[PDB]
Structures are given as C-alpha cells and as structure tokens.
Amino acid sequence: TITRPIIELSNTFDKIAEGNLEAEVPHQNRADEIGILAKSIERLRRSLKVAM
Amino acid sequence: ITRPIIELSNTFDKIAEGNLEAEVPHQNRADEIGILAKSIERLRRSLKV
Amino acid sequence: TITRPIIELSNTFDKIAEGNLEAEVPHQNRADEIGILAKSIERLRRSLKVAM
Amino acid sequence: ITRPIIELSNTFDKIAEGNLEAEVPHQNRADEIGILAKSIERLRRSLKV
Fold first, then answer.
1. What whole-number distance in Å separates Cα of residue D13 and Cα of residue B11?
2. What Cα–Cα distance (Å) separates residue C12 from each residue in A19, C20, C21?
3. Containing domain of residue B21, as a range?
4. Residue C1: partners with Cβ closer than 8 Å, 6 or more residues away
5. Among B17, B45, B47, residue whose Cα is nearest residue B27
C-alpha cells in the first residue's frame, strides 16, 4: 500500500478510470506484484484506447 | 464496462491509502479487468504479510 | 478473397464492427495470413468488449 | 475509434468480394487496428499472387 510506487499506480489507474487514456503507466519494468499490476493496467489502457 | 473499472479503481485507492482489508471486486471475470482485479488482490494479500 | 474462410472472416468482422462482440471469431487456429488476420480480429474483439 | 474499424471492415468486404486493388486504410497505426490493417493488406497482396 504504503510505498510510493503503489500510490503512483493508484493515481495512474484513477486517471484511466476517468477516461484519461494518454497518461503513461509507470512501474511496468519489474517482475514483482507491483510490476504485474502495472502491466495489467497498461494492457487495459491500450484496450480502452483502441475502443475510443 | 466503465462501472467495474471505476469500482476497481476506487477499491485500489482504499488499499493504497492503507486499508488492506478492502474487498476486491471482479476477480472472477475472464478478461483484462479480472486479471487486474486478481493482481490487486495478490498485492493486497502480499502487503498484509 | 475468394475462399470461404475469407468470406466468413469478413462476415465476422462486419458483425464486430456493428457492435456485436459476442460472435465467435473463426479460423484462428492456423498460421497462414488467414490465421494471423483472424487472431488480430479476435484481439480487437476482446479489447472492444472490455471497453463496453 | 469506431470510424476506423468501420472503414477497415468495409475495405475487407471489398477485398472478400474480389476487389484485390482496394486501398487498405490505417496501416500506420501503432495499435491493434493498425495490426489488423497490416494483416488485411498482407492477405490482399498474397491473393494478387
């Protein structure tokens, strides 16, 4: 929860959930749970953008 | 499917603000929203210890 | 153009372009140009469905 | 981005009805629509011989 990468991902997913599909998804280039979650947010962003 | 995406972004905000008991919705979907929900749930479990 | 798998993919992509995201994309399980095109139509279908 | 998807479905209908000269739109996009357009264009070329 408590670390900065987590809060930053939460901010990024709030922007995508409000329809801002251009903002860059941080913290992808890692293999732990933070990186798995970041890559999922990124794939969802790309799908929502192709649909718009 | 904005409703489930908004629900899951609100739940991740609760976990990121230190509520590690938050129930994570939509884990059973067989699409990217259910993969994201599963990953939020795995992160939540890992933080709890 | 002229073969049945091609016409069938064209029908399937017409349905997805009209918003019918449930119909099954045929001809994916092959490696030639027909199968590459079918798998692309399928990935687009899945993205449009997650966005809806 | 329904407009480009409708455009590319209409172009694929022209090729599937035997117009192998049809210009295929949207090949330069860097997303799934541009991958689909590229694959329609590759199929069109392959049919022409």
1. 44
2. 29, 9, 10
3. 1-49
4. D15, D16, D17, D18, D19, D20, D47
5. B45
* CATH number reported for the structural domain that contains residue C47 in this entry: 1.10.8.500
B21 known ligand binder: no
| Resolution for the entry shown, Å | 1.3
In a mutational test of the A interface, the residue from C21, C45, C50, C52 whose CB has the highest number of chain A CBs within 10 Å is C50
C6 contacts D18? CB cut-off 8 A: no
How far off is chain D from A24, nearest CA to CA, in Å?
16
How many folded domains does chain C comprise? Answer: 1
Q: Which pair of structure tokens corresponds to residue B21?
A: 């008991």
Q: Is the separation of the CB atoms in B37 and B25 below 8 Å?
A: yes
| Chain A positions in Cβ-Cβ contact with residue C52 (cut-off 8 Å) | 51
CB contact under 8 A, C6 and D39: no
